[PDB]
Amino acid sequence: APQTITELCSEYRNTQIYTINDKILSYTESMAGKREMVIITFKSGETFQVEVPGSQHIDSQKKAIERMKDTLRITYLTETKIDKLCVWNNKTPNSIAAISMKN
Amino acid sequence: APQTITELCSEYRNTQIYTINDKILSYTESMAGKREMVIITFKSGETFQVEVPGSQHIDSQKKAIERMKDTLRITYLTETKIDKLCVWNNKTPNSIAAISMKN
Amino acid sequence: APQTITELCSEYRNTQIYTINDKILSYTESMAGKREMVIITFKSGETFQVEVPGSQHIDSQKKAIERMKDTLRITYLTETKIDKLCVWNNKTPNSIAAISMKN
Amino acid sequence: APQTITELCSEYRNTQIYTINDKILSYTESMAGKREMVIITFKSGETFQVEVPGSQHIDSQKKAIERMKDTLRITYLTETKIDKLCVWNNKTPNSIAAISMKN
Amino acid sequence: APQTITELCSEYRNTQIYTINDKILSYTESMAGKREMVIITFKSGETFQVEVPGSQHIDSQKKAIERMKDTLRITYLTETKIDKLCVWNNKTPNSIAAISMKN
Numbered sequence: 304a305p306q307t308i309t310e311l312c313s314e315y316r317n318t319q320i321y322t323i324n325d326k327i328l329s330y331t332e333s334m335a336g337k338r339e340m341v342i343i344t345f346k347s348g349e350t351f352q353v354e355v356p357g358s359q360h361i362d363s364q365k366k367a368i369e370r371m372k373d374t375l376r377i378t379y380l381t382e383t384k385i386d387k388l389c390v391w392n393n394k395t396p397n398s399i400a401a402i403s404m405k406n
Numbered sequence: 407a408p409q410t411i412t413e414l415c416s417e418y419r420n421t422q423i424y425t426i427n428d429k430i431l432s433y434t435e436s437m438a439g440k441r442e443m444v445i446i447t448f449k450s451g452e453t454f455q456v457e458v459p460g461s462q463h464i465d466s467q468k469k470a471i472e473r474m475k476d477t478l479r480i481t482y483l484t485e486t487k488i489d490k491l492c493v494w495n496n497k498t499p500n501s502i503a504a505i506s507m508k509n
Numbered sequence: 510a511p512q513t514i515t516e517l518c519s520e521y522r523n524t525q526i527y528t529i530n531d532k533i534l535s536y537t538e539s540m541a542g543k544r545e546m547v548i549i550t551f552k553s554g555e556t557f558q559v560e561v562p563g564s565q566h567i568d569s570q571k572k573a574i575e576r577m578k579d580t581l582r583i584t585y586l587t588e589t590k591i592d593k594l595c596v597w598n599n600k601t602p603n604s605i606a607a608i609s610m611k612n
Numbered sequence: 613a614p615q616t617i618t619e620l621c622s623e624y625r626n627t628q629i630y631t632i633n634d635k636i637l638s639y640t641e642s643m644a645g646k647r648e649m650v651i652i653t654f655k656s657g658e659t660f661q662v663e664v665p666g667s668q669h670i671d672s673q674k675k676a677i678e679r680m681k682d683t684l685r686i687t688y689l690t691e692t693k694i695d696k697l698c699v700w701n702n703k704t705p706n707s708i709a710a711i712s713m714k715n
Numbered sequence: 716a717p718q719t720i721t722e723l724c725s726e727y728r729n730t731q732i733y734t735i736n737d738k739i740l741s742y743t744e745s746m747a748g749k750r751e752m753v754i755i756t757f758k759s760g761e762t763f764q765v766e767v768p769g770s771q772h773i774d775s776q777k778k779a780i781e782r783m784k785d786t787l788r789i790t791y792l793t794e795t796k797i798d799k800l801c802v803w804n805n806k807t808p809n810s811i812a813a814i815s816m817k818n
């Protein structure tokens with residue numbers, strides 16, 4: 304298995320690493336129909352989403368999608384510095400695939 | 407996908423944005439039959455609910471409804487300042503569709 | 510929908526409001542068979558339960574019962590002041606229907 | 613229903629109350645097959661488990677077993693003082709039936 | 716049942732104990748398809764994973780896998796010192812079977 308977020312990100316098409324090195328500036332969460340998603344922004348101006356679950360996701364990703372949103376909320380609330388994001392860049396906003404944080 | 411709560415809110419009928427810019431004043435949670443819901447208030451006097459799950463909700467909203475109540479409780483407990491709420495105004499109290507918080 | 514805990518409580522038979530205005534003194538949690546429940550007490554001497562799930566509960570209440578126990582544990586741990594409880598008084602200890610907290 | 617941990621404990625064969633009056637010294641969690649369990653110890657030298665789910669458990673106990681492990685982890689992390697444990701003494705380590713904490 | 720992480724670890728083939736005695740340096744979480752996993756590192760240079768769920772896991776381990784990832788995230792966030800890890804050494808990075816923390 305991959306040993307780092309960069310190694311993991313390299314396994315996928317339509318991905319890149321953003322080096323954030325910052326806490327989340329804003330957290331947005333929606334339960335509106337067809338828009339059940341989270342949006343985060345950074346003071347850099349960058350915006351990312353956790354996508355609405357759909358056919359681009361396999362069954363094993365369902366719990367992982369819910370965990371990622373859990374992680375983003377608590378990261379926001381604790382002002383925890385995010386190191387890197389691996390994102391799909393074929394979506395607007397870019398879609399989060401993986402997150403790393405270092406201490 | 408939308409990049410902000412205001413963009414998201416505009417996609418729906420019977421919605422508006424409330425600019426809260428404040429922590430939650432009170433948190434109310436009910437497990438009583440047919441009233442399984444959360445109500446929050448602000449010192450402004452405004453009151454909002456997360457609705458009881460019903461036929462106005464699609465399957466993808468079920469986990470999202472539970473998440474929103476999770477978010478409101480921890481937001482209350484941490485005295486986290488809410489930025490905006492996107493609400494359905496065809497309900498009393500107005501019904502929460504999305505929340506944003508900024509730091 | 511109701512706008513306050515008192516309004517909500519008034520919709521049900523065999524209920525009343527206790528005004529607590531205090532943190533939880535003790536928290537008890539059981540996983541013993543047929544006694545899967547939580548008991549809380551206050552320095553006033555009042556004791557309350559979240560009942561074991563049973564036929565007095567409809568399907569919509571199952572997640573709500575689990576949320577209520579989640580709420581009591583974290584409220585206990587954070588020493589959060591409870592404002593009111595709406596309880597069913599036809600049970601010993603009185604059984605929690607709703608909880609409010611204010612800040 | 614019982615109003616205290618001692619009342620509840622008394623309802624069961626093969627149980628006893630340990631008065632702990634202390635925080636958890638160590639927390640151990642296993643996801644190893646057939647050993648999906650939690651072990652806690654105290655500076656007293658006592659060791660307790662939450663048992664692996666098995667045929668000695670009824671369906672209503674499944675969520676309660678998961679809740680108890682959730683409770684022990686957060687109690688450990690917050691250094692919360694445990695008051696009493698109701699344990700089954702026909703297991704090694706003794707198996708947790710109920711927990712109480714007072715403030 | 717085992718009374719310590721070392722006793723538990725000894726029940727399994729392809730395992731060993733790492734004595735960590737340190738907080739987590741980095742936390743990485745992925746929701747990418749077929750890589751739904753967590754990776755942690757320590758300043759020692761050691762790297763560990765919670766494996767993607769697969770046929771090497773029995774049904775009883777599914778909830779335990781999810782709990783282990785929950786534990787690693789909160790442990791990271793709270794800077795909680797890990798005592799030992801029991802890991803399967805037939806995987807790269809080594810795969811976490813059990814964790815202990817002491818206070």
Ligand SMILES: CC(=O)N[C@H]1[C@H](O[C@@H]2[C@@H](O)[C@H](O)O[C@H](CO)[C@@H]2O)O[C@H](CO)[C@@H](O[C@@H]2O[C@H](CO)[C@H](O)[C@H](O)[C@H]2O)[C@@H]1O
Nearest residue numbers: 643644645728729766770771772773776803804805806810
């Ligand atoms: C169902 C089960 O126990 N699976 C494990 C597997 O079991 C073997 C039995 O299927 C076989 O019949 O008997 C032998 C003992 O004589 C085994 O118990 O054994 C494999 C390999 O040892 C285990 O795989 C391990 O799984 C863990 C995760 O649970 C981890 O991924 C580790 O890397 C891996 O080797 C099965 O657990």
Ligand SMILES: CC(=O)N[C@@H]1[C@@H](O)[C@H](O[C@@H]2O[C@H](CO)[C@H](O)[C@H](O)[C@H]2O)[C@@H](CO)O[C@H]1O
Nearest residue numbers: 316317354359360361391393394398747748
């Ligand atoms: C079943 C399967 O392998 N499906 C893949 C898709 O995952 C993939 O789409 C990507 O999906 C991710 C999230 O899983 C994200 O939404 C990306 O934007 C999206 O492109 C698709 C194209 O690579 O291939 C399918 O095989």
Ligand SMILES: CC(=O)N[C@@H]1[C@@H](O)[C@H](O[C@@H]2O[C@H](CO)[C@H](O)[C@H](O)[C@H]2O)[C@@H](CO)O[C@H]1O
Nearest residue numbers: 335336419420457462463464494496497501
């Ligand atoms: C199946 C479907 O799309 N149904 C929608 C409804 O969502 C919508 O009702 C709104 O639902 C939201 C919660 O999702 C909230 O309760 C609003 O108060 C409610 O009006 C309905 C009416 O506009 O349109 C349907 O198409």
Ligand SMILES: CC(=O)N[C@@H]1[C@@H](O)[C@H](O[C@@H]2O[C@H](CO)[C@H](O)[C@H](O)[C@H]2O)[C@@H](CO)O[C@H]1O
Nearest residue numbers: 439522523560564565566567597599600604
């Ligand atoms: C099955 C059903 O709908 N039963 C209702 C009950 O809700 C109600 O009983 C009350 O149930 C609550 C928990 O929901 C609590 O346990 C109360 O103590 C209990 O009385 C019953 C009595 O009014 O009415 C039924 O129709």
Ligand SMILES: OC[C@H]1O[C@@H](O)[C@H](O)[C@@H](O)[C@H]1O
Nearest residue numbers: 542626668669700702703707
């Ligand atoms: O509910 C679980 C309990 O069930 C009993 O019947 C058993 O003797 C106890 O040791 C405990 O495991």
